[PDB]
Each structure stands twice: as structure tokens, then as C-alpha cells.
């Protein structure tokens, strides 16, 4: 209870505020709990913003389960309520290239999605739905590089127009 | 002359510190320039960023001109540091989506790439290379989107392995079957 108030009102705070305006006053305004308590639960700020790209990667990673990352990419042009908490996850990208010890825990925050899409392409390889003339890495990488691009799109202020025929565009390309 | 120094000083700051990070001093630092020199020019950190965006989107306009977005992105393979101050697009995204003005600067300092790719994609039609199943504009923003992707990718230190075959099947992808 407390963790999941903390998590749901840190979300709106780092959105509202950005990654260094997320103060920690801040973040007790927006959750109702005290620095201490914030902490008890997360450590510090960044382990609070690991655990919310984490809450990202299993969300994601159902999506991925049911119909792979162009249906998370779907999603994305149905919630332009959440452009702002893309934005603040794309503030972190310098530290990620820089950091080890903060890049080896992003990577494993996002390890279930990681997983999931490696599954995910797995079962349409098994069930003879990729293009077989490009091996299956390269269609991943096409696959993350194109998520990539729709992140930044959004979170830097593109429209919507013709994304979900990319989107089929996407889908057609992988396939047989 | 100053003014490429002032840019080239600029653009090592931005790549090395970021946007936020690129203080007077640093940029001093990059430039050796007093900041008189450096801003008397330029005012202020967002237009000397938006000239900067204008320089290299000329650039690529060029290489667009050659072979299209799917050559930039090969270049960009072929040594990364040079367009690596983009990566502050992913620090300043919001201001970008939520500031109209500084947004509208943004495009519009974008413009002669913007031009270049629609040039490049209308004479790919004309000679009846591009598929015709898809339009032209799904084409142009997969294009677009592809190379925001790689941007993201570089910036976030991704390996660029498996990379250059990926722009082959982009490539494959947009044209005639
Ligand atoms: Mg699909
Ligand atoms: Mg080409
Ligand atoms: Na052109």
C-alpha cells in the first residue's frame, strides 16, 4: 500500500516536475508520505525511478505477451497522457551510456521485457510468421530501434499523423 | 570563421555535457571564446543549440541529396561522435513538445532537411523505386521515425551491432516488390 502510494504519486511528480525538479519535498506533496518513509521503501531518488521503469517493463511486457511491441507502440498513440513520464525516462540517457553501476541496474529493471519480446518472436518463428530470409536478431533490433524512434517522437512533440499505418508498415516488414 | 569555431566549440560542449550541463564556463571551455564573443552572436544557449540544429540539418540535407535518410544513418554508424550532440534532443524533449515558440524554431531550423528528404523521396517515385502500396508520406515518417531510433540508440551507448543490416531491410522495406 504505502510502496504503491509512493510509486503512483512519484510517477506524477517526475511527469509534472522533470528528473532533477522531482525534489524530494516534491515527492512527499505528491504522495502524502514522508522523505523517510519514501526512503525506507526505495533507498534514494534513483532507485524510486528504477522501480518506475520497472512498473513500465512489466506493463510492458504483458502487452508484448498478447501481441508483440508494435501493440505497446499502439498503445503509446492511444495515451498522450503519458508523454510527459516518456519524457522524464529520456532525461536519464545520458547517465545509462556513462554510469556503469546505474546502466547494469537499468538493464535489469527492464529484463522482463527483455525477455518478453525474446519469447514473443520465438513462438512467431515457431509458428512460421517472420520472414525466415533476415535472421530473427535483426528483425529485433529493427523492432526496438523503430520503439526507440516512437518514444522520441512522442516525448519531443510529434504528431500522431500516419503512425499507425508505420505501425502496419512495421508488422508487414517482419513477416513472411 | 569565429562563427564555425563558436559552433564546432558548441557542439563538442553539448555532446560532452548535454544541454543543462553546457554552463558559460564549459562553454568558454569548448570554445575558448569569452561569452561575450560566444552569445553577443547568438544571445542566448536555446539559439546557439538552434543553429547548431540548423548547420548539421544542412549537412544531412546533402547526404539525403546523395542517398537518402538511410545514408545519414550509415554515416552515423561510421563514426558516431559527429552528430552526437543530438543526443540532447532526449534532455529537452518536453520543452520541445510543450514550448509552441521553441518548437516552431525547432522545425523551422530543421527545414532544409525536412526539404531534402521530400526532394529525395519524390525522385525515388519518379524513377518507380518506392512501393506504391504504402504512401509516400507512411514512407517518409517510417523514415523519419527510424533515424529518431538511432539518435536514441547512440545516445543511450546501445551497441550499433546488427545495425547496418538493419537499414538494409529499412531500405528493402520502402522500396518495390
Ligand atoms: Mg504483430
Ligand atoms: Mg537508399
Ligand atoms: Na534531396
Redesign the interface.
Known amino acids: 500500500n504505502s510502496r504503491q502510494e509512493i510509486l503512483e504519486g512519484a510517477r506524477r511528480c517526475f511527469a509534472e516536475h ?1 528528473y ?1 525538479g522531482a525534489t524530494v519535498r516534491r515527492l512527499e506533496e505528491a504522495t502524502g508520505k514522508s522523505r523517510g518513509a519514501i526512503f525506507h521503501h526505495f533507498g534514494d531518488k534513483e532507485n524510486l525511478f528504477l522501480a518506475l521503469a520497472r512498473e513500465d517493463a512489466a506493463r510492458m511486457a504483458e502487452v508484448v505477451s498478447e501481441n508483440g511491441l508494435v501493440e505497446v507502440m499502439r498503445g503509446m498513440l492511444e495515451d498522450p497522457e503519458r ?2 513520464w ?3 525516462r ?2 536519464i ?2 547517465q ?3 554510469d556503469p553501476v546505474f ?1 547494469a541496474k537499468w538493464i535489469d529493471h527492464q529484463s522482463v521485457l527483455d525477455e518478453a519480446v525474446r519469447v514473443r518472436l520465438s513462438r512467431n518463428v515457431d509458428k512460421g510468421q517472420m520472414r525466415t530470409d ?2 530473427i ?3 529485433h ?2 523492432l ?10 512522442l ?3 510529434a504528431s500522431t ?3 499507425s ?2 505501425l502496419d ?2 508488422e508487414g ?1 517482419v513477416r513472411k
Open positions: 522533470g532533477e508523454y510527459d516518456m519524457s522524464v529520456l532525461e540517457s545520458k545509462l551510456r556513462t546502466r533476415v535472421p536478431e535483426v528483425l533490433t529493427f526496438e530501434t523503430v520503439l526507440d524512434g516512437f518514444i522520441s517522437r516525448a519531443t512533440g499523423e500516419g503512425l499505418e508505420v508498415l512495421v516488414t
